Amino acid sequence: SIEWYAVHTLVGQEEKAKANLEKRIKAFGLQDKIFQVLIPTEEVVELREGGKKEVVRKKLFPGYLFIQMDLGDEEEPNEAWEVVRGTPGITGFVGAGMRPVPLSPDEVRHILEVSGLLG
User: Fold this and answer.
1) What CATH number labels 1-119?
2) Domain map (residue ranges) of the chain
């Protein structure tokens, strides 16, 4: 019933925007609308010896952030959008038709499988 709202951000600051953002979402109390918050980055594990392990991930969608929120209120989204639009980790939007950029189901499964949900 919900949807994956994806928005644009600053390159390099995205990783920092998550903390500054996630905090505001919990500080104000918006955990009821936002459920998931996956990052457009592929995971890759690499080990050489036992004891020490280093795992990294490649960002497929730069400056992109997929959030399975619930903006399906009625006309316009809830305060959740205001928080993100005001968070230090926000610059603007795609600049096409609307402010956000909801992904499609067929696309979500593809961006979620790479993130770390489906596999």
Assistant:
1) 3.30.70.940
2) 1-119
Q: Half-sphere exposure of residue 101, counting CA atoms within 13 Å on the CB side?
A: 15
Task: Report how far residue 33's alpha carbon sits from residue 88's, in angstroms, rounded to the nearest whole number.
Answer: 20
Cα 45 from Cα 43, distance rounded (Å): 7
What was the experiment behind these coordinates?
NMR
- In the beta sheet, which residues pair with residue 58? 42
Find the radius of gyration of the CA atoms of the chain. Answer: 15
Name the token pair of 81: 């959008």
- DSSP assignment of the chain equals --EEEEEE--TTTHHHHHHHHHHHHHHHT-TTT--EEE-SEEEEEEE-SSS-EEEEEEESSTTEEEEEE---SSSS--HHHHHHHHSTT------SSSSS-BPPHHHHHHHHHHHTS--
Asked if 43 and 6 touch (Cβ cutoff 8 Å), the reply is no
Retrieve residue 101's tokens. 């950029």
